Amino acid sequence: SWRHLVCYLCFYGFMAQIRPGESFITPYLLGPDKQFTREQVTNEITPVLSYSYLAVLVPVFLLTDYLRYTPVLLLQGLSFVSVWLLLLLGHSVAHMQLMELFYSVTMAARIAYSSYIFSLVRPARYQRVAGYSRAAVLLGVFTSSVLGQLLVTVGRVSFSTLNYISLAFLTFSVVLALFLKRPKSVLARMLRELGDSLRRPQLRLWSLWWVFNSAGYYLVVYYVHILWNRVYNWAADAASTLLGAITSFAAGFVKIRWARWSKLLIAGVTATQAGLVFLLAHTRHPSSIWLCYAAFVLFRGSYQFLVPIATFQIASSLSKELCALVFGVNTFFATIVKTIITFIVSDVRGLGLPVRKQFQLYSVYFLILSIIYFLGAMLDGLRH
């Protein structure tokens, strides 16, 4: 088991996030194969996915740590297979709502796999394993996106044959997941553990970083595609994913003194993200779109550089074997913050503003987050 703890785990992550037909779900639901209603794919499947994400995350993060991370990893593949079987069979919109529910089910085994790595390896290579696995995950996402875009734009095969390839790769991912080794008032136990671990400085900082910076990252990523909506969009996404994989690898390889040079790093990367968001918002010249794409890929790399470090620091600082619960509560809070900000600002009944203004307030949001982190770094060090 000298390779099947890191090398095989990273290979499984790479093979699990290979779904060439995942980005083409909406066109497939709109093409001649499975002709649907334009409003149905908007008011019937997107809302059910959005609500079921939280409704499924709530028990997943509670149960994955107790289940020892193997059942949830297998359930990810089984639910992806169910999603694609529903996509292939199709039938009525009830099947599509079931497909979106199963997709929301898959969305939380992300946190399951993220917490698996630190329960697989010893608490001395957490950073190098977090970087390896995040790099493998982002490489898998990039390979899936490239595979899909190459098959449709170049190979022009179909939206069904691409889905068959996706089904084959998902079944192989399930086969791989079956061979992963299983690590060896519970509600009150978890509540007491969280109450005791919140007081730690390294868990609290990276927990408050996850629930806010990631929520800002989701908001920017979602609103970039709204602004974008083209070959120069999927290409930008693939470049951003490759840069994210490379930066996750670097984070798994970087060796600095943490708990002293940590809040400064967070503040610096957040300020860089705020600058890139400002550049994205304040650039509309016709001969400047490549600069916008470069800003997007740099923002994605900046965010994905900290995710392995955040996971390693949340796992290392924990004194109990339930890193899955902390990862899940952070992801749940990030999604809740994103939903709250969208409802408060983006809603028509709320302070409804165009996409450019949306990026202006998100630029100032990243700015104030960076300012708060820099102020924390200037107030903790001043109390040396």
Ligand X SMILES: Nc1ncnc2c1ncn2[C@@H]1O[C@@H]2CO[P@](=O)(S)O[C@@H]3[C@H](O)[C@@H](CO[P@](=O)(S)O[C@H]2[C@H]1O)O[C@H]3n1cnc2c(N)ncnc21
Q: Which residues are annotated as a binding site for folate?
A: 25-26, 100, 110, 141, 217-218, 222, 300, 304
Among 189, 192, 225, 284, binds ligand X (CB under 6 A): 225
Closer residue to ligand X in complex, CB, 225/282: 225
* Residues 97 to 126 in contact with ligand X, rule: CB under 6 A: 107
**Residue 338 binds ligand X, judged by CB under 6 A:** yes
**Residue 218 binds ligand X, judged by CB under 6 A:** yes
For 143: left if phi > 0, alpha if psi spans -120 to 50, otherwise beta; the answer is alpha
Part in contact with ligand X (CB under 6 A); list of ranges 132-140, 142-150, 214-222, 254-262: 214-222
Closer residue to ligand X in complex, CB, 146/264: 146
At 269, the amino acid letter reads V
Among 7, 222, 343, 344, binds ligand X (CB under 6 A): 222
Part in contact with ligand X (CB under 6 A); list of ranges 90-98, 184-192, 216-224, 376-384: 216-224
**Residue 49 binds ligand X, judged by CB under 6 A:** yes
Among 85, 146, 221, 345, binds ligand X (CB under 6 A): 221
Closer residue to ligand X in complex, CB, 214/270: 214
**Residue 69 binds ligand X, judged by CB under 6 A:** no
Compute the distance between CA of residue 184 and CA of residue 383 in angstroms, rounded to an integer: 42
Compute the distance between CA of residue 166 and CA of residue 170 in angstroms, rounded to an integer: 6
| 98 φ, ψ (degrees, to nearest 5) | -65, -40
Compute the distance between CA of residue 311 and CA of residue 279 in angstroms, rounded to an integer: 29
* Residue 219 beta carbon to ligand X: minimum distance, rounded to whole angstroms: 8
Compute the distance between CA of residue 80 and CA of residue 381 in angstroms, rounded to an integer: 47
* Residue 222 beta carbon to ligand X: minimum distance, rounded to whole angstroms: 3
* Residue 156 beta carbon to ligand X: minimum distance, rounded to whole angstroms: 21
Q: What is the 3-state secondary structure (H, E, C) of 187-252?
A: HHHHHHHHHHHCCCHHHHHHHHHHHHHHHHHHHHHHHHHHHHCCHHHHHHHHHHHHHHHHHHHHHH
Number of residues that bind ligand X (CB under 6 A): 10
* Residues 226 to 285 in contact with ligand X, rule: CB under 6 A: none
Among 14, 53, 113, 296, binds ligand X (CB under 6 A): 53
**Residue 335 binds ligand X, judged by CB under 6 A:** yes
CA distances from 374 to 106, 175, 194, 244, 364 (A): 36, 47, 26, 24, 15
Q: Which residues of 288-327 are buried (b: 16+ CB within 10 A; e: fewer)?
A: eeeebbbbbbbbbbbbbbbbbbbbbbbbbbbeebbbbbbb
Chain residues binding ligand X by CB under 6 A are: 49-50, 53, 107, 218, 221-222, 225, 335, 338
